[PDB]
Amino acid sequence: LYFQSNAVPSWKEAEVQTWLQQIGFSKYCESFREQQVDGDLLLRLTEEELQTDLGMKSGITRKRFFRELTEFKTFANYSTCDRSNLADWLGSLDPRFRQYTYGLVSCGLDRSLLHRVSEQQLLEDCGIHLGVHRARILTAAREM
Amino acid sequence: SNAVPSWKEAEVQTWLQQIGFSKYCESFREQQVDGDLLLRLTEEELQTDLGMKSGITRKRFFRELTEFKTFANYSTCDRSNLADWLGSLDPRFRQYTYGLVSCGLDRSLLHRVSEQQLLEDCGIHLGVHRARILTAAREM
Amino acid sequence: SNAVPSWKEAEVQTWLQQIGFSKYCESFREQQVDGDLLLRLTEEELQTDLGMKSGITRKRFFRELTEFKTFANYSTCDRSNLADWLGSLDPRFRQYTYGLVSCGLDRSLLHRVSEQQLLEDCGIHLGVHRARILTAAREM
Amino acid sequence: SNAVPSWKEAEVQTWLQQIGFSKYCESFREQQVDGDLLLRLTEEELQTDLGMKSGITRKRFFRELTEFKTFANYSTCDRSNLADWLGSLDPRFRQYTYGLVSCGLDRSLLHRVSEQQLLEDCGIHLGVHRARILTAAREM
Amino acid sequence: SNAVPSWKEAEVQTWLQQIGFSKYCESFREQQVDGDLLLRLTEEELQTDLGMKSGITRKRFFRELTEFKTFANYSTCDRSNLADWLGSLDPRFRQYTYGLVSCGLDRSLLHRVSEQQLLEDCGIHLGVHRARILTAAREM
Amino acid sequence: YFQSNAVPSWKEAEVQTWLQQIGFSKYCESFREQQVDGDLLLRLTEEELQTDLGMKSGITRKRFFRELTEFKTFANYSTCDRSNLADWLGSLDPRFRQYTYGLVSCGLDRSLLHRVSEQQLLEDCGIHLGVHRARILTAAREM
Amino acid sequence: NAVPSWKEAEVQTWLQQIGFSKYCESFREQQVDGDLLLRLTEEELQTDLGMKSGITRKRFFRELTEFKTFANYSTCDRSNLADWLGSLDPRFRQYTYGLVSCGLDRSLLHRVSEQQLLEDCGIHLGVHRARILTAAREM
Amino acid sequence: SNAVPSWKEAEVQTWLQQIGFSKYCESFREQQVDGDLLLRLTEEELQTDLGMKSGITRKRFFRELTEFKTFANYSTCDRSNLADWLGSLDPRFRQYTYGLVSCGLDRSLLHRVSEQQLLEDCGIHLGVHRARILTAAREM
């Protein structure tokens, strides 16, 4: 086990700034601070925000960025905002599914409400883009 | 104060400073934004009419505004206490109070509202929120 | 006066000054806006033909105009008193009086109007209002 | 002369002067607008071919034209007296006479006309008017 | 001198002069417009290839052409006397003769025609005309 | 005027003389720069006429296709129509012989006609008039 | 003869033999070999190879269709799909490389759909698609 | 090293030289393309971000890349040995291994995959391949 500044939802701008340096994206440090990107905004970043508001011109560079961010979201501490422990429920299906925790929690979802979620809600509201991931989370939510 | 519907332009000016958006004070006052207009601000108005170019800055602004909508005093315009009905489902649902009352809705009329009206008229964009408010309203 | 349908350009000019929109006086007289045109003003005419560029400023304008439409004298054109029928249902619904009477509608013909007609012909944009006016019309 | 269908370009020119639209006399004359073309004038033709840029000014024009169309002499072209049948439902409906007469319609053929035809062929844009004319035509 | 299908360029040139369209004489001869092309002229061909920019002027042009098509001699190409079948329904329906004959249609084939064919192939744009011609054809 | 009516076999020289016979000698040079032979002439589209051959006017194109349609009606298709689809089309309407090359270029013949669809007649064979498509379609099924 | 096996040199000689020596330089800068020639699309012809005229492209594909019809596919058509397609209609043998490039053969042909023949194998004519399919189903 | 998924930028640089695409080394290095990104390269990324404008050159590139993907070492990332399951149906199908493995798929989950998912998520564009993989996966 380890000690880590790991609670991404609680991150302020300084934590995001250090993280960009840690992943080799120090080129965008000034851009992330002028936009005042904190933990909550980082977890809700869209490609449009990355491209237009943060200036990440290359689609490959954006793929690299989101590849790093997805890695960190998978191993993030969500305890400050996940009272139902939605993270460990997603992890029980697949460790890779922990990345969706903040998306589900930001919509006010929890274990008790999962059985009524739809595919459109998982895509538009929670931002689960991969249909394979949506389908497995969906069928698991309805089988309870 | 917290009775946002009754806010005048001066209160909106004070609130923008408290949330770190003092750069946009002059533009909000040139547009004469009061409590009612602040509660009905759309992304297009923020971007074009108020000059908030960045979509991230707009996300920050609406994140602050959504917090205040959750803990606002709506007593001056909410005769049926729609706010505590929304809060009984989820505290975050109180933010939709002004949207629901501006359409003339109240507890007596809620069971007949549609998903389409909740999205186009009341401005509830998240489908999880629309669907939950919808099912709860019909169980009346 | 209070009879907005009967207003001439001079009354519209005085009304714009009284509501703090004297900035748009010259534009409203160039377009020769009288009472009938004011009550049928669309957002497109406001923006393009009258030069009200800001969507927030237009929202303020229609908020004032909605108030005066709610408390207007329609005696010269509302023989069936559709205004007080709409007002008895919901105070804000009285603003729609001129939209319905300009289409030749009245109490006797109201029950056969559709939601499409209320939106396209009479200009009732809020779907909640359209549904309530319609449902009440059928209960006659 | 009150028989608009029989109007020549000179009559249209005099009529524009009587309604305060003499500014557009020269445009109407180079476009050779006579009575028949005036009664079939569309908004797009007004805007592009006649140069009436403002939507409010176009609304005033059609407001005058609709008034004249309601109290017009159709004896030269209305073999079935469709005008007084339309007027018997609502005086406002005489304005549609030339639209129906231009399509070769008459009292005998009204019962088989559709709402799509009244809108696309005859140019009756208001759905409330279309619905009343249809229900009355099919019920005679 | 009314057998439009047989017209050469010289006949079209004089007709344009007779109807006050001498402005477009040279354009019609550079395009080598003869009787057959004139009877099949589209609005797009008028606007783009013949330079008739104004939509009102094109409406005026087609108003003259439609009048002439109504009183034309089609004997050289109408074996089935489709003109008098259309004329027995309505004198104005004779204008559609060349549209029906150019598609290889005749009385024997009419009962099998659809509305889409009358619109797209034969060029009967008015739905009231299409619907009457259609129902009469099926009652054979 | 002198010409083999077997249009499918035409070479570039035949197309050149044919363009002159119909008064389109202005477009001869463009037709030879594009190397239009009998097969290409019978498959010319409005797009090719406008862009590749430079016939800007839609009326001039209508005039051209009016000339071309007449020759297509009275052409010799014997070199490529083993099933004699031409006289089958002619039995419905003489003007329907114009569609012969369109039908044979798609590999159609009498034996396959009963299974052809409306979409195939429009997209593949190029029969644009719906009245013609509908009559040819119903007639093929009556076999 | 074995078009699938052609290298750039064979394509260069073929362009000269069909009178398209004007496009040798563009075909050589794009390094068109046999496999690319058999999969050439009109978009590639126009944009990447510079054949601006749609009529010239139609002429080119008319020559290419000729050679695809009479090509030796032995190096890549183990199921001899070519002579099966040609036996239905000579016009159909040109499609051989399109079907074998998708891993198709006689045994799997009956399982192909009309949409697949158009999108995957590139058989544009609907009349050809329908005939090849119904014959495959009667196999 | 044949294990393309574990490749670093240096391996991708060496691979581009071996396949004759050393022209694009500088662009692939400026974009920091490693093994994982190379196996997920799209047509748009090749064109816009890597500067391979010619569609034929891109077709050549993907022809080489598909070859290496078919005979690649997936032991570091293919826990279910999806590669040899795909290869047993058709050797060409090993090329899809990383597409399915990147979506968290394995042998146990294949029977529930849809054609839409194979195309949108895993990037299997040929419908014939999609149909064969599905039918075989469901026959388990």
* Chain H residue numbers touching G30 (CB-CB < 8 A): 54, 56-57
Asked if the C-beta of C75 comes within 8 angstroms of chain D's C-beta atoms, the answer is no
Amino acid at the residue H56: I
Residues B5 and B69 in one domain: yes
Q: How far is CA G23 from the centre of its chain?
A: 19
| Residue positions counted in chain H | 140
Q: Tokens for E139?
A: 């009652």
Backbone angles phi, psi at D115, to 5 degrees: -65, -35
* Chain D residue numbers touching E59 (CB-CB < 8 A): 37, 40, 45
Contact of E123 with E99, CB cutoff 8 Å? yes
d(CA D40, CA D102): 9
**Domain limits for position H4:** 1-77
Terminal C-alpha separation, chain C? 34
CA atoms within 13 A on the CB side of C78: 23
CA atoms within 13 A on the CB side of H13: 10
Residues with Cβ within 8 Å of A132's Cβ and at least 6 positions away in sequence, in order, are: H103, H104, H105, H109, H113, H117, H121, H122
What is the CA angle G31-G46-G119, rounded to 5? Answer: 90
d(CA C53, CA A6): 47
Q: Where are the alpha helices (DSSP H) in G1-139?
A: 8-17, 24-29, 34-38, 42-43, 54-69, 81-88, 96-101, 106-109, 114-119, 126-137
D5-43: b or e for each residue (b if 16 or more CB lie within 10 Å)? bbbebebbbebbeeeebeebeebbeebebbbbbbbebee
Residues B1 and B64 in one domain: yes
d(CA C28, CA A108): 49
Among C99, C102, C101, C105, which Cα is nearest to C124's?
C99
Residues E69 and E87 in one domain: no
Residues with Cβ within 8 Å of H23's Cβ and at least 6 positions away in sequence, in order, are: none
Residue at a domain's end among A27, A46, A81: A81
Asked if the C-beta of A83 comes within 8 angstroms of chain B's C-beta atoms, the answer is no
* Chain E residue numbers touching F135 (CB-CB < 8 A): 104, 109, 112
Residues B41 and B107 in one domain: no
Find which of C121, C122, C124, C133 to mutate to test the D interface (most D CBs within 10 Å of its CB).
C121
Residues A9 and A73 in one domain: yes
D119-128: b or e for each residue (b if 16 or more CB lie within 10 Å)? eebbbbebbb
Contact of E89 with E133, CB cutoff 8 Å? yes
d(CA A44, CA A125): 11
Q: What count of other Cβ atoms lies within 10 Å of the Cβ of residue D129?
A: 22
DSSP sequence for H18-72:
HTT-GGGHHHHHHTT--HHHHHT--HHIIIIIT----HHHHHHHHHHHHHHHHT-
Contact of C113 with C105, CB cutoff 8 Å? yes
d(CA A122, CA A125): 6
Quick check: B32 and C92 CB within 8 A? Answer: no
Amino acid at the residue C65: L
Residues with Cβ within 8 Å of B116's Cβ and at least 6 positions away in sequence, in order, are: C127
Q: Tokens for A142?
A: 């309805």
* Chain D residue numbers touching C114 (CB-CB < 8 A): 127, 131
Quick check: C90 and B104 CB within 8 A? Answer: yes
Residues F75 and F85 in one domain: no
Q: How far is CA A69 from the centre of its chain?
A: 7
Q: Tokens for H137?
A: 């996966």
Experimental method: X-ray
Among A105, A106, A116, A108, which Cα is nearest to A141's?
A116
Quick check: D112 and E90 CB within 8 A? Answer: no
Q: What count of other Cβ atoms lies within 10 Å of the Cβ of residue C139?
A: 7
What is the CA angle G51-G54-G56, rounded to 5? Answer: 60
Residues C41 and C99 in one domain: no
B52-88: b or e for each residue (b if 16 or more CB lie within 10 Å)? bebbbbbbbbbebbeebbbebebeebbeeebbebbbe
* Chain B residue numbers touching C131 (CB-CB < 8 A): 112, 114, 117
d(CA B16, CA B64): 10
| Residue positions counted in chain F | 143
d(CA A36, CA A56): 16
Asked if the C-beta of D43 comes within 8 angstroms of chain E's C-beta atoms, the answer is no
d(CA D64, CA E137): 42
Asked if the C-beta of B19 comes within 8 angstroms of chain C's C-beta atoms, the answer is no
Q: Which of G31, G47, G119 sits opposite H55 (nearest CB)?
A: G47
d(CA C34, CA C7): 6
Residues with Cβ within 8 Å of G125's Cβ and at least 6 positions away in sequence, in order, are: F106, F107, F124
Q: Where are the alpha helices (DSSP H) in chain F?
A: 12-21, 28-33, 38-42, 46-47, 58-73, 85-92, 100-105, 110-113, 118-123, 130-141
- Give the C-alpha distances (Å, rounded to integers) separating F99 from F43, F95, F103, F125, G127: 11, 9, 6, 7, 15
Backbone angles phi, psi at A44, to 5 degrees: -110, 10
One-letter-per-residue 3-state SS of C28-40: HHHCCCCHHHHHC
d(CA F94, CA F112): 21
Question: CB-based burial of residue E100 (10 Å sphere; 0-12 exposed, 13-18 middle, 19+ buried)?
Answer: buried
d(CA C36, CA C99): 10
- Cα nearest neighbour of H51 on chain A: A58
Residues E52 and E1 in one domain: yes
Question: CB-based burial of residue F64 (10 Å sphere; 0-12 exposed, 13-18 middle, 19+ buried)?
Answer: buried
Quick check: B32 and C126 CB within 8 A? Answer: no
- Domain count of the fold of chain G: 2
Residue at a domain's end among H77, H94, H123: H77
Quick check: E128 and D104 CB within 8 A? Answer: yes
- Cα nearest neighbour of H130 on chain G: G116
d(CA H73, CA H67): 13
- Give all chains having 3 or more CB-to-CB distances under 8 Å with chain B: A, C
- Cα nearest neighbour of F117 on chain G: G127
| Residue positions counted in chain G | 139
Terminal C-alpha separation, chain D? 32
Q: How far is CA D19 from the centre of its chain?
A: 16
Q: Report chain H's C-alpha Rg in angstroms.
A: 15
Residues with Cβ within 8 Å of A101's Cβ and at least 6 positions away in sequence, in order, are: A73, A76, A78, A82, A86, A87, A90
d(CA C51, CA D56): 12
d(CA A96, CA A132): 12
Q: Tokens for D93?
A: 């409906």
Quick check: C116 and D127 CB within 8 A? Answer: yes
Q: Which of D45, D109, D117 sits opposite E127 (nearest CB)?
A: D117
Asked if the C-beta of B101 comes within 8 angstroms of chain C's C-beta atoms, the answer is no
Residues B51 and B104 in one domain: no
Contact of E115 with E137, CB cutoff 8 Å? no
Among C116, C105, C80, E128, which Cα is nearest to D129's?
C105
Q: What count of other Cβ atoms lies within 10 Å of the Cβ of residue F1?
A: 7
Torsion of CA F1, F6, F9, F15, to 10 degrees: 30
Residues with Cβ within 8 Å of D134's Cβ and at least 6 positions away in sequence, in order, are: D113, D114, D115, D118
Q: Tokens for H132?
A: 């064969």
Residues H85 and H114 in one domain: yes
What is the experimental resolution, given in Å to one decimal place?
Answer: 2.7
Asked if the C-beta of H8 comes within 8 angstroms of chain A's C-beta atoms, the answer is no
Residues with Cβ within 8 Å of F82's Cβ and at least 6 positions away in sequence, in order, are: F109
One-letter-per-residue 3-state SS of A49-89: HHHHHCCCCCHHHHHHHHHHHHHHHHCCCCCCCCCCCHHHH
Asked if the C-beta of G129 comes within 8 angstroms of chain F's C-beta atoms, the answer is no
Contact of C94 with D109, CB cutoff 8 Å? no
d(CA A27, CA A32): 10
d(CA A90, CA A137): 8
Give the 3-state secondary structure of residue H84: helix
Q: Which H or E run includes D54?
A: none
DSSP state of D122: S
* Chain C residue numbers touching B104 (CB-CB < 8 A): 90, 92-93, 126, 128-129, 132
CA atoms within 13 A on the CB side of B112: 12
What is the CA angle H136-H138-H140, rounded to 5? Answer: 85
- Give all chains having 3 or more CB-to-CB distances under 8 Å with chain C: B, D
Amino acid at the residue H65: L
Q: What count of other Cβ atoms lies within 10 Å of the Cβ of residue F13?
A: 10
| Residue positions counted in chain A | 144
Q: Which H or E run includes D107?
A: none
d(CA B132, CA B93): 10
d(CA H14, CA H2): 12
Give the 3-state secondary structure of residue B126: coil
Asked if the C-beta of A59 comes within 8 angstroms of chain H's C-beta atoms, the answer is yes
* Chain E residue numbers touching D103 (CB-CB < 8 A): 126, 128-129
Q: Tokens for F112?
A: 């396959």
A115-134: b or e for each residue (b if 16 or more CB lie within 10 Å)? eebeeebbeebbbbebbbbb
Question: CB-based burial of residue G3 (10 Å sphere; 0-12 exposed, 13-18 middle, 19+ buried)?
Answer: buried
- Give the C-alpha distances (Å, rounded to integers) separating D13 from D33, E20, H11: 9, 19, 83
Contact of A102 with B123, CB cutoff 8 Å? no
* Chain E residue numbers touching F59 (CB-CB < 8 A): 31-33, 37, 45, 49-50
Asked if the C-beta of C115 comes within 8 angstroms of chain B's C-beta atoms, the answer is no
DSSP sequence for B31-100:
TT--HHHHHT--HHIIIIIS----HHHHHHHHHHHHHHHHT---TTT-TT-HHHHHHHH-GGGGGGHHHH
- Cα nearest neighbour of C135 on chain B: B112
Residue at a domain's end among G52, G76, G100: G76
H helix count then E strand count, chain H:
9, 0
Residues G106 and G88 in one domain: yes
Residues F26 and F36 in one domain: yes
What is the CA angle E44-E45-E47, rounded to 5? Answer: 65
Distance from CA of A1 to the nearest CA of B (A): 35
Place of tokens 């602004």: B61
Region of G71 (left: φ > 0; alpha: ψ -120 to 50; beta: rest) is beta
Backbone angles phi, psi at B110, to 5 degrees: -65, -35
Contact of E19 with E47, CB cutoff 8 Å? no
